[PDB]
Enzyme design. Structure first.
Site, PDB file in Angstrom:
ATOM      1  N   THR A  16      -4.679   6.595   9.143  1.00 53.16           N
ATOM      2  CA  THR A  16      -5.500   6.844   8.011  1.00 53.16           C
ATOM      3  C   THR A  16      -5.639   5.612   7.163  1.00 53.16           C
ATOM      4  OG1 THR A  16      -3.667   7.501   6.724  1.00 53.16           O
ATOM      5  CG2 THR A  16      -4.680   9.218   8.081  1.00 53.16           C
ATOM      6  N   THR A  17      -5.060   4.468   7.535  1.00 52.07           N
ATOM      7  CA  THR A  17      -5.298   3.238   6.803  1.00 52.07           C
ATOM      8  C   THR A  17      -5.853   2.243   7.846  1.00 52.07           C
ATOM      9  OG1 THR A  17      -3.185   2.259   7.261  1.00 52.07           O
ATOM     10  CG2 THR A  17      -3.210   3.723   5.359  1.00 52.07           C
TER      11      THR A  17
ATOM     12  N   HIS B 149       6.599   7.039   5.743  1.00 52.61           N
ATOM     13  CA  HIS B 149       6.027   6.620   4.467  1.00 52.61           C
ATOM     14  C   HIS B 149       5.356   7.817   3.841  1.00 52.61           C
ATOM     15  CE1 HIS B 149       2.842   6.133   7.478  1.00 52.61           C
ATOM     16  NE2 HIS B 149       2.022   6.462   6.508  1.00 52.61           N
TER      17      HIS B 149
ATOM     18  N   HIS C 100       2.078   9.252   1.054  1.00 54.55           N
ATOM     19  CA  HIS C 100       0.815   9.043   0.360  1.00 54.55           C
ATOM     20  C   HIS C 100       0.932   9.994  -0.810  1.00 54.55           C
ATOM     21  CE1 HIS C 100      -0.973   6.735   3.608  1.00 54.55           C
ATOM     22  NE2 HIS C 100      -0.364   7.595   4.392  1.00 54.55           N
TER      23      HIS C 100
ATOM     24  N   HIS D  27       0.803  -1.213   0.000  1.00 54.52           N
ATOM     25  CA  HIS D  27       0.000   0.000   0.000  1.00 54.52           C
ATOM     26  C   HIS D  27       0.840   1.269   0.000  1.00 54.52           C
ATOM     27  CE1 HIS D  27       0.105  -0.594   4.612  1.00 54.52           C
ATOM     28  NE2 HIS D  27       0.459   0.669   4.480  1.00 54.52           N
TER      29      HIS D  27
ATOM     30  N   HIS E 272       4.451  10.991   6.287  1.00 51.96           N
ATOM     31  CA  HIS E 272       4.122  10.760   7.659  1.00 51.96           C
ATOM     32  C   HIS E 272       5.284  10.118   8.390  1.00 51.96           C
ATOM     33  CE1 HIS E 272      -0.339  10.431   6.298  1.00 51.96           C
ATOM     34  NE2 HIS E 272       0.062  11.655   6.527  1.00 51.96           N
TER      35      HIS E 272
ATOM     36  N   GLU F 295      -3.263  13.610   2.255  1.00 51.29           N
ATOM     37  CA  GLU F 295      -4.403  13.110   2.997  1.00 51.29           C
ATOM     38  C   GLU F 295      -5.094  14.290   3.676  1.00 51.29           C
ATOM     39  OE1 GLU F 295      -3.113   9.576   5.291  1.00 51.29           O
ATOM     40  OE2 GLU F 295      -4.248   8.739   3.648  1.00 51.29           O
TER      41      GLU F 295
HETATM   42  N1  LIG Z   1      -1.110   6.640   7.477  1.00 48.78           N
HETATM   43  S1  LIG Z   1      -0.802   6.683   8.918  1.00 48.78           S
HETATM   44  O1  LIG Z   1       0.291   7.548   9.208  1.00 48.78           O
HETATM   45  O2  LIG Z   1      -1.880   7.160   9.684  1.00 48.78           O
HETATM   46  C1  LIG Z   1      -0.337   5.109   9.369  1.00 48.78           C
HETATM   47  C2  LIG Z   1      -0.755   3.941   8.818  1.00 48.78           C
HETATM   48  C3  LIG Z   1      -0.193   2.827   9.362  1.00 48.78           C
HETATM   49  C4  LIG Z   1       0.677   3.165  10.369  1.00 48.78           C
HETATM   50  S2  LIG Z   1       0.795   4.849  10.621  1.00 48.78           S
HETATM   51  S3  LIG Z   1       1.448   2.030  11.418  1.00 48.78           S
HETATM   52  O3  LIG Z   1       2.810   2.000  11.058  1.00 48.78           O
HETATM   53  O4  LIG Z   1       1.427   2.549  12.747  1.00 48.78           O
HETATM   54  N2  LIG Z   1       0.804   0.696  11.242  1.00 48.78           N
HETATM   55  C5  LIG Z   1      -0.474   0.553  11.941  1.00 48.78           C
HETATM   56  C6  LIG Z   1      -0.476  -0.675  12.693  1.00 48.78           C
HETATM   57  C7  LIG Z   1       0.381  -1.749  12.549  1.00 48.78           C
HETATM   58  C8  LIG Z   1       0.103  -2.727  13.465  1.00 48.78           C
HETATM   59  C9  LIG Z   1      -0.955  -2.427  14.309  1.00 48.78           C
HETATM   60  S4  LIG Z   1      -1.630  -0.875  13.950  1.00 48.78           S
HETATM   61  C10 LIG Z   1       0.587   0.425   9.823  1.00 48.78           C
HETATM   62  C11 LIG Z   1      -0.557   1.341   9.289  1.00 48.78           C
HETATM   63  O5  LIG Z   1      -0.793   0.984   7.936  1.00 48.78           O
HETATM   64 ZN   LIG Z   2       0.296   7.691   6.361  1.00 51.31          ZN
END
Ligand SMILES: NS(=O)(=O)c1cc2c(s1)S(=O)(=O)N(Cc1cccs1)C[C@@H]2O
Ligand SMILES: [Zn+2]
Ligand SMILES: [Hg+2]
Length: 256
Positions: free
Chosen positions: A195-196, A91, A93, A61, A116, A103
């Protein structure tokens, strides 16, 4: 499962992640006239001097640059935060055209991409524990506009070719994240979410006022990535962003 296409895009996420319709979802539109200047907000403290990057991964993604977060090396403090938040990954977007891709939007203006830098609250011991808490994460968001090349970005751009598809990673040590920051550290802050999926509402969002510009050839490289794995049909990784969610009785404070 989820993604950004017509069949599995943002508008379908609620079916598997009901929190998508919750009370502090992100991203939001920042309306600059309604954001409240709060003079009690301390300055941000970005200590990215001892940052240790490890690798870059196309996760299907976005591509992530992971950092060794076993000690307080690159940390964020001050601003709206209480406590130390460790950098774990960053990462982007981005869009399929230069007029979309961020976003967060500012007075409804969309930028070409948004960076981000994801931090978790060390109070909670590990990342997994931090995503169970309302103040578990702080993400620093930076808008990218197309203009002059960003020197600090080029190292990332040159490696994207080795991680073209889903699941490829490449070693990526000694990258310094400080070369991605704007000059000013002025910001807007509000409580929000990832946001994902899983869209957890663990995040204090710090969105910088000042965008960095990158060249068109640099963001063009982003667009060549693939969503699919090797041997699957090619779907270009573009438009991996979520539309703005309703602010519903949150206030965006401004540090300026
Ligand atoms: N777009 S965003 O900055 O808001 C983020 C998306 C994602 C982030 S931050 S994460 O690295 O924290 N991770 C979330 C989690 C992993 C395990 C449990 S929850 C992956 C997410 O895709
Ligand atoms: Zn992000
Ligand atoms: Hg949470």
């Amino acid at each position: 499962h989820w993604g950004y296409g017509k069949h599995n895009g943002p508008e379908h996420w609620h079916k598997d992640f009901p929190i998508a319709k919750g009370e502090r979802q992100s991203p939001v539109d920042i309306d600059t006239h309604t954001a409240k200047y709060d003079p009690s907000l301390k300055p941000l403290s970005v200590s990215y001097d001892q940052a240790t990057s490890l690798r870059i991964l196309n996760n299907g993604h976005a591509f992530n640059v992971e950092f060794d977060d076993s000690q307080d090396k690159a940390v964020l403090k001050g601003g709206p935060l209480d406590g130390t938040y460790r950098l774990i990954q960053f990462h982007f977007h981005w869009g399929s055209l230069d007029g979309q891709g961020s976003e967060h939007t500012v007075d409804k203006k969309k930028y070409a991409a948004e960076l981000h830098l994801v931090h978790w609250n060390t109070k909670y011991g590990d990342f997994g524990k931090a995503v169970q808490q309302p103040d578990g994460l702080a993400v620093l968001g930076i808008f990218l506009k197309v203009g002059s090349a960003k020197p600090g970005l080029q190292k990332v751009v040159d490696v994207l070719d080795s991680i073209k598809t889903k699941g490829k990673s490449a070693d990526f040590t000694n990258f310094d994240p400080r070369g991605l920051l704007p000059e000013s550290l002025d910001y807007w802050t509000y409580p929000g979410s990832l946001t994902t999926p899983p869209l957890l509402e663990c995040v204090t969002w710090i969105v910088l006022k000042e965008p960095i510009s990158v060249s068109s050839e640099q963001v063009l490289k982003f667009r060549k990535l693939n969503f699919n794995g090797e041997g699957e049909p090619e779907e270009l990784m573009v438009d991996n962003w979520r539309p703005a969610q309703p602010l519903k009785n949150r206030q965006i404070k401004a540090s300026f």
